[model samples]
Target: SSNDNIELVDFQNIMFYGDAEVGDNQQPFTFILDTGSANLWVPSVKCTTAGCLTKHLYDSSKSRTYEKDGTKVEMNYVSGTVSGFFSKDLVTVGNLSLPYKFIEVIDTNGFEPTYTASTFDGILGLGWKDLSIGSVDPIVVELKNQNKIENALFTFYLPVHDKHTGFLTIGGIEERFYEGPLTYEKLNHDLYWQITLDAHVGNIMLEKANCIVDSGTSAITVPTDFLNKMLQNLDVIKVFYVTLCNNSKLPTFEFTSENGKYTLEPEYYLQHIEDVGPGLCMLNIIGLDFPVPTFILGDPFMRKYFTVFDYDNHSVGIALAKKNL
Candidate 1:
């Protein structure tokens, strides 16, 4: 398949999503191109939850290509749980199309009140095939098998301060999108694009752990131990806010991988500061209670670098964004 590039809409720098068609009826759906998870899911009308009640739901009865398979499917996230079943349907993204089994969430239970807050309706997991819950091949893997994509690779150029929408390129690299050389990092595992991370907050070493390069997560998450340590070193509690007076005193955090060292500036470290109040701004990072590889590198790092997920070589490439220039 020829290379397909899709424009992604960034919502408040929290999440990025793209439009796609589902089933033979070509029903339009907005989906988050999530690299963290392994299966695609859309809200189904069967779900009577408050979140699903008002949004676009996949009505299997309306699609000619919809095939019902009773295999139960459920995805548990830090936010909530989505439960549904495997249903085969025609999924299309840009020039690529595949008849694949995807989760149709009949219920979004826990996060009912919070689910509808997102502008996008669904999630498209671009992780490896093995990570898929239903044993279904991810859209990217299927495209690669069919030789529909120019390369078994995808690149993401996430907007930092730019007003223009970001772009996701599949199959080939766009030379103009990034500047300088692409530094490649070997994947520790294919499950979530896991990689080795050596991170430091000030001079305190924090990341002798594994990290997932996740597009689905909004902010970088660290383990509790590291989080507490970082907070103490920064001379603030977890509830600390950034301001002009204290912004300059914020420490620089650095992340090192096989690719080399990348540092986060004080401005980026603080996330955002409120102009109206001194204590209203929030730190961009949070604590994740998960295992070893205890961090999820989300949009914060991505906005500073153009990242490429290369399946062919089983590695990821990262470099400074050309847009910054």
Candidate 2:
């Protein structure tokens, strides 16, 4: 039993992944250690999508520990939908192996371009069970139930410069990696890892600051209604909910709360695509319409703060990260 450190492949600060093995034969797979989601999924052998062909498909035929639970589950994204069925097998990660149930995606309809080019094979969600699809218990919760971890918590450390470097410490926090006292913030709700925060881009103030601290997301995402007004204040050209900003010298995205004041700089907030022409890097902020006025504090925020998600206490601890460099 070990909650050992899981080293991540931080791909261009866009996605973070770790190594894992699945099935009785120890089939190796790379999993995105996602804190935003609560369930795990991988491409199944039956998956016929072109992207699935590129991925290491879970061949249930080979695994003696494979248990079939063919409950069809479908998840729709703003771009597309993915449909899959449940399956069970032994999953090994960071010196710990356990029998776990996860989804085997059979159809990755809209995720063709990205899924096909994705560096990781699957996702191992670390969020609370309330956010899980089909209401499946999270792997972390299952591990806790089995008494495999030293503490019922985890910590994430995202490096600023490393293209393939990050850390996910399960069941404990290494205080030595951070400075200052850890400030614990109560979760706004039990769904996502949300915290109360008010934010402003330039002089435009946001309506609802219900910010979800999501590690899976790459950039700061705002509500559609707020984005409309915010975009109007800036010189931007839209490419299907995207933009090329004319105002090159951008202001910092300032966040305020009773706990503390945080700011995201332009360098971190700007989305840069390599090999693109000069002066074309767009603002990384995204806009999506939601039932609630929700915002996402993603990679940029985490890179600035050392975050510890406490499962037992239902709180999040934030502190300044101490970089060895």
Candidate 3:
């Protein structure tokens, strides 16, 4: 009975989603599998936010198992902000089902207008339970506590294709998706799925920084100063624009550790190249003005490997990716 598959919306590769059943009637929800945050949240039927209007909202009245907790919740993201209230419902993913406390967003505030452009209706957090906005049980932890899954483990495989294609295996690792043994890293802090950096792309050293392996983030976010220096070193002018053929000469980014070295080639670092009809192309890895000197490894890194988030041991495992073709 331990089964759950990750599904992507399209070729954007920005997000991967999974199906979940909530409430007594088991209303369906499409949720993003996010490793950076800890909490399950869906839009409430009462949400009037611009982003919420287009998604499938949850109606508490339709479910006999609904219970309002009246606890307020607010969170700020690099892209936007959300505020909501807590509630309890029967939540199910794959063959596992359990009654869980989750958030139901009623108001959203931010500048990112197209946040809901993807097909996903909500987010399913996979981080530690200690990081929950409210002291609610984490989905993975709850499943493990109830002995619903074989193990307190989950794996992600993001293929190199341009379709809604990927697999998220819960309860245990799927050895077929990865080649070679996985390299392990300790989670630096409990709040995020982070690890210490022993990395460098070209001559720019990126060590001593906390790198969050976030599935929710879309790009690699570095400090503003580091980004500028890296761009200057690579001759990538105008922040995001680089010569179309310049990518051929780019160096691979490597992360050194006790296990070995994990490298990301130019294709993985550069978001994408705009045709621009000519030699001009855009390389997209921008800096965030956040408070910490952290690296947010997003889709670019995940797409290159099969990753595992082990809640039981509080560690991360990664191996070379297997192409869908």
Candidate 2 lDDT, 1-325, residue by residue in tens: 2457777666776656788888999888888677788878888889987778778888989999999899988865444457899889998777777899888889986676777777777777788888888787777667788888756788888855553367788788887668877888778887778888787876678744888888877778888767777777456668733344445646678777777667787777776664465556667778876787888888877877889998889888888777652
Model 1 residue runs over 4 Å out of place are 206-208, 233-246, 273-280
Tell me the deviation in Å of residue 51 in model 1: 0.8
TM-score for all models, in order of appearance: 0.92, 0.89, 0.91
Regions more than 4 Å wrong, model 2: 1-3, 161-164, 240-249
Q: What ranges in model 3 sit over 4 Å off?
A: 1-3, 239-246, 273-281, 289-292
Give lDDT per model, in order.
Answer: 0.77, 0.77, 0.76
lDDT of 1: 0.77
What is the alpha-carbon lDDT for the whole of candidate 2? 0.77
Give RMSD (Å) of candidate 3 vs. truth.
Answer: 2.4
Error of 2 at 21 (Å): 1.8
- The superposed Cα distance between candidate 2 and the true structure at residue 233, in angstroms, equals 4.5
